Amino acid sequence: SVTPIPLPKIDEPEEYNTNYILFWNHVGLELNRVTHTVGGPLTGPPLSARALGMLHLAIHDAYFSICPPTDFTTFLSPDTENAAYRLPSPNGANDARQAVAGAALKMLSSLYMKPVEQPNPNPGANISDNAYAQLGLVLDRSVLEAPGGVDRESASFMFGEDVADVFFALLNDPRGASQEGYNPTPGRYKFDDEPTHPVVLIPVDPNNPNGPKMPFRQYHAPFYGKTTKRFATQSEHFLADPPGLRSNADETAEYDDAVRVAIAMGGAQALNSTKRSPWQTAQGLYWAYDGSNLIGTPPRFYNQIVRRIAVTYKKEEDLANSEVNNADFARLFALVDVACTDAGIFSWKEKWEFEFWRPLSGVRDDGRPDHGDPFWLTLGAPATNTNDIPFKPPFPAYPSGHATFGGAVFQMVRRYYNGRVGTWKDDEPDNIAIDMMISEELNGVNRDLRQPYDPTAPIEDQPGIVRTRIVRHFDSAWELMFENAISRIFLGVHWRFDAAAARDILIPTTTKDVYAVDNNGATVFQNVEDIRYTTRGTREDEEGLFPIGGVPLGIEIADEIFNNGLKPTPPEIQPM
Ligand code: VO4
Numbered sequence: 277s278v279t280p281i282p283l284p285k286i287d288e289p290e291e292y293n294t295n296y297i298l299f300w301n302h303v304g305l306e307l308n309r310v311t312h313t314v315g316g317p318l319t320g321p322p323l324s325a326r327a328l329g330m331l332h333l334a335i336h337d338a339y340f341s342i343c344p345p346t347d348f349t350t351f352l353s354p355d356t357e358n359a360a361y362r363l364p365s366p367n368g369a370n371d372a373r374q375a376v377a378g379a380a381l382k383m384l385s386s387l388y389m390k391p392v393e394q395p396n397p398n399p400g401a402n403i404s405d406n407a408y409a410q411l412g413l414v415l416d417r418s419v420l421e422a423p424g425g426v427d428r429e430s431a432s433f434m435f436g437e438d439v440a441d442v443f444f445a446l447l448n449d450p451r452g453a454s455q456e457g458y459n460p461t462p463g464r465y466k467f468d469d470e471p472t473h474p475v476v477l478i479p480v481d482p483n484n485p486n487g488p489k490m491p492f493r494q495y496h497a498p499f500y501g502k503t504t505k506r507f508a509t510q511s512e513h514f515l516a517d518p519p520g521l522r523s524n525a526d527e528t529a530e531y532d533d534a535v536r537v538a539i540a541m542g543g544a545q546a547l548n549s550t551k552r553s554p555w556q557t558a559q560g561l562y563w564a565y566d567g568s569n570l571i572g573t574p575p576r577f578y579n580q581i582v583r584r585i586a587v588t589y590k591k592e593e594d595l596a597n598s599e600v601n602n603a604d605f606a607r608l609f610a611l612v613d614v615a616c617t618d619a620g621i622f623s624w625k626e627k628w629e630f631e632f633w634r635p636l637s638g639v640r641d642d643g644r645p646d647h648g649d650p651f652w653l654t655l656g657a658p659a660t661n662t663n664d665i666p667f668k669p670p671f672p673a674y675p676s677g678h679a680t681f682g683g684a685v686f687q688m689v690r691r692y693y694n695g696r697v698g699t700w701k702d703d704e705p706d707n708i709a710i711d712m713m714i715s716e717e718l719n720g721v722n723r724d725l726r727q728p729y730d731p732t733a734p735i736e737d738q739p740g741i742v743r744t745r746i747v748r749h750f751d752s753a754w755e756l757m758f759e760n761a762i763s764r765i766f767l768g769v770h771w772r773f774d775a776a777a778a779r780d781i782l783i784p785t786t787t788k789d790v791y792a793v794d795n796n797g798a799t800v801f802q803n804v805e806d807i808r809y810t811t812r813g814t815r816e817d818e819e820g821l822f823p824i825g826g827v828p829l830g831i832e833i834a835d836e837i838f839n840n841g842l843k844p845t846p847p848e849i850q851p852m
Pocket of ligand 1: 676
């Protein structure tokens, strides 16, 4: 019925998918990239993370229900009185492979299928039937490629689907990304539609693309972080007021230097004012994954990296028949993906709370003849595998979602591997190194097209400029976390403070809030080995010191989840 979209090859050993836990993570990642290529459900950063958090939670409890863990316990218990939180019981079901399969297939089906359950109005109603059909191909195919096969008649398989139903019913946020009712309030430091993509024309009817179109101003998930059910966090998380706002409105020198730096480090390639280096351009594009065709969102890359870390540091050589390895991955991916989910909730909550402007607009609309540049252009979020120009993600700047996701994800890996891969203090540089890590943004295959993307053809048969293939080696998760955060500065899409306190990542000078520059005028960063996310700030509405930027927020979120052992967010503290 549909022409299957030809997906490019993934840079990763085929041996990885011989382990059924990695297999299902993989299918989750394939659905992630395909929904961003066809415009289906669970698009965007916060919600694409949630989909992975829900998949792994279900896989987690189904597996540990059949092979009970020694230290921790299942996220939900079978003995809980509260129905919503009551885990189904196996009752003789004892096939862990089939329970995971049923749980992964059910969750992924429930998440990505055409909502025939009637309740689909306005939730995400703008998805064509092709989008749905393309995602169905991925689902059907996955049943066929699953290592060990899939037995739908199996009691263990049925038990798994039962597990998924509970998690879906409890944690699904059908209308989470609703933009309905939100409109920007222009003014200094205020988020508004970005000048290079002020409005978009979208077909009136998704199932009628070449028919009429209508103007559209997109605001990504403005009510989500403030209303959605948290996963495993045990408290609300907050950041300090960004420079220029509220209690930090007097941080004039900090703000102004942030403008200077923004221009020199994140401008477009050919601008005279751009002092960023070719290598720094690489670090910026490496971590993008900005909802592009055949690429998806950041959570997809974070997982690609985590899969690599898991195989490199596994306890047993056998990827196919090792319960030790199965247990390790089910636990790790649940921890990392639940942390990613919550990182997404809180970074989005803060974004829309402060509604801080993007550097493109903060620079153009500065208003001061000697400080602003009313015609500046950023390197921008790359629109890979399209023929479109770079863009500014459709949501406020503070804090950076990438920085939060990275802080959460990599702080989780560190807490998990400390003592296994090396030894270090909780908040100090780790030993978790990896090599041969390739980003899909720079793999010698993906490209910037010269004509609109053709979904019926392989990317290699489509004219455009190919992204240089860069194979990377990283010394630690600290470096991964750090580079992922500063990547948004090189792209010009985030202010330094959206990442972390300037004081924690930049080299100071004798002038306050003004950091070091080299001869060509480029910003000098602290060595990764020396970076400590310790600089806090104040809030107008709350007492005390709070972290600055996304990195500390994510770290804080991962520590809390881990220290509590992956346990539900108490309902008493859920948004109401
Ligand atoms: O979420 V960003 O918030 O890093 O372009």
